[PDB]
Design a binder for these strands. Structure first.
Lengths: 89, 93
DNA sequence: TTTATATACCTTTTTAGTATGCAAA
DNA sequence: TTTGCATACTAAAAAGGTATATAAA
């Protein structure tokens, strides 16, 4: 599992659509759909209900989303505070 | 930047060695070295002490290392919890 | 010297892009 | 119908492997 999976999944959940999330991140919709499949096949857990329009998270996917943004918000903290330390000698 | 980069960096710092870390990660040494280089270049900061052999972190790299471990741990915790839920053996309200 | 990391070069794997099918409303 | 996610295929990007040059110890 890479950050790509979280970054993409979060986008899908936030925009409640693959197509809009695709456009938000400036990638094609299919390779986005494939990443979300791979994530789910890796975990062995279905995170989104489909069709169903718009897309909705499953209870598991909801929990996973809530956590994923905590993690991604931390990658931000991590990187930015690292850079702050580099600037200064 | 991806989790693999963190996972690699962590290996190198712990083993204080690219060749040992690469053996543990089951890839060759040259890939590991480039991946680390890429991570450094992508952030634009030096994480490791090149020039000294018992390979050591820079102050920035040290902070980054300590953060990474918490991050990677929370990734495991997320997955572990999600599975617990998904198996329907939740003890989460 | 020896021993470990960086570079050069090539292969394999993964991800992104395009065309299009198919299902939801 | 129109609209949006999925599947099939191709293209590009990125990761990984082997050989070897190079710099610490």
């Amino acid at each position: 599992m890479e950050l790509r999976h979280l970054r993409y999944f979060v986008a899908v959940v936030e925009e409640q659509s693959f197509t809009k999330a695709a456009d938000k991140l400036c990638i094609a919709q299919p390779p986005l759909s494939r990443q979300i499949q791979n994530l789910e096949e890796e975990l062995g857990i279905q995170l989104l209900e489909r069709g169903s329009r718009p897309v909705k998270t499953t209870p598991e996917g909801h929990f996973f989303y809530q956590y994923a943004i905590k993690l991604l918000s931390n990658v931000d903290q991590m990187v930015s505070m690292t850079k702050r330390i580099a600037s200064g000698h």
